[PDB]
Amino acid sequence: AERTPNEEKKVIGYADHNGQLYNITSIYGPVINYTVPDENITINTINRTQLTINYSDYVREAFNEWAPSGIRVQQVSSRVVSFSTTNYADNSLGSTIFDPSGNSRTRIDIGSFNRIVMNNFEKLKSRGAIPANMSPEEYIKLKLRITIKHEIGHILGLLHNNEGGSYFPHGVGLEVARCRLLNQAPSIMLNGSNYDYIDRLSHYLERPVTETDIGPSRNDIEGVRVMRRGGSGNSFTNRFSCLGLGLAF
């Protein structure tokens, strides 16, 4: 594997107005209770493609992706985490509201997917970021899992890689769990305005990318471990996740 640039391994957590990281254990409880409405998601584009799949299995699978952080969950039938679909068609596949009261909401726009999900299908094909093998059907599932996993990151108190020091409704982004010494995949919390996760992931893997490849990076997981215990954003135990390695120098 190639060497992921530090900027793509940087993980930013949500701190309040006094530099203290939100505690997602305190916010959600020891177990994250969440609701997911019954429908299978009905996305399809014209180039015409066709696809439907259960929202519940993807929230299921995505959550398990983040399980190495030590978080534990439980789907609860309709202050609770809310998943849903929307139809704004507004140039934004997914969106999450982080709520310190516990009622964090994640929405997956269906209209935006139908419009812009394949806008990068063959600039990804030809650069070899995705296998020429894959169908329009599974490039849309790939994008959906990535989108959902990314939004889960937000549920769990993470922001985007480049939002350190930036102000948000409930505070400020502060870098957590820094580790530059250990090579790893790019964060799945890359700012989508500035990076294409698939392209960066492929760049790292030095080959086309499938769905067994995507997921939270090592630092993403350590970031959530920090968010699970909260505390000061200036604490060294919170700011660094492999500084012990410095002793080997």
Partner 1 sequence: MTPQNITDLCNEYQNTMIYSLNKEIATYTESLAGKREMVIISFSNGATFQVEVPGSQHLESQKRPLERMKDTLRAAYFTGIKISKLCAWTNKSPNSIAAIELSNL
- Residue 14 sits in the site that holds partner 1 (CB under 8 A): no
User: Which residues in the 171-190 window bind partner 1 by CB under 8 A?
Assistant: 180-183
Please check whether residue 179 is in contact with residue 9, taking contact to mean a CB–CB distance below 8 angstroms: yes
Please check whether residue 227 is in contact with residue 158, taking contact to mean a CB–CB distance below 8 angstroms: yes
Q: Which is nearer to partner 1, 23 or 120 (CB)?
A: 23
- At 37, the amino acid letter reads P
Residue 170 among known ligand-binding residues: no
By CB neighbour count within 10 A (0-12 exposed, 13-18 middle, 19+ buried), where does 149 fall? buried
Q: Which is nearer to partner 1, 169 or 244 (CB)?
A: 244
For residue 160, the SS3 value is coil
- Residue 122 sits in the site that holds partner 1 (CB under 8 A): no
Please check whether residue 221 is in contact with residue 34, taking contact to mean a CB–CB distance below 8 angstroms: no
* Strand boundaries in 40-156, DSSP class E: 40-43, 51-54, 73-75, 81-86, 94-97, 105-109
Please check whether residue 139 is in contact with residue 121, taking contact to mean a CB–CB distance below 8 angstroms: yes
Query: Angle of helix 197-205 relative to helix 136-155, nearest 10 degrees?
Result: 100
Window of 95-103, 119-127, 129-137, 237-245 that interacts with partner 1 by CB under 8 A: 237-245
Distance of closest approach, residue 7 Cβ to partner 1, in angstroms: 10
- Residue 6 sits in the site that holds partner 1 (CB under 8 A): yes
Distance of closest approach, residue 152 Cβ to partner 1, in angstroms: 27
Window of 96-104, 138-146, 194-202, 238-246 that interacts with partner 1 by CB under 8 A: 238-246
Distance of closest approach, residue 231 Cβ to partner 1, in angstroms: 11
Q: Which is nearer to partner 1, 117 or 185 (CB)?
A: 185
Number of shown-chain residues binding partner 1 (CB under 8 A) = 21
Distance of closest approach, residue 99 Cβ to partner 1, in angstroms: 30
Query: Between the CA atoms of 161, 166, 167 and 170, what dihedral angle is there, to the nearest 10 degrees?
Result: 30
Please report, as ranges, the residues that interact with partner 1 according to CB under 8 A: 2-3, 5-6, 180-183, 234-237, 240, 242-249
Binding residues for Zn(2+): 150, 154, 160
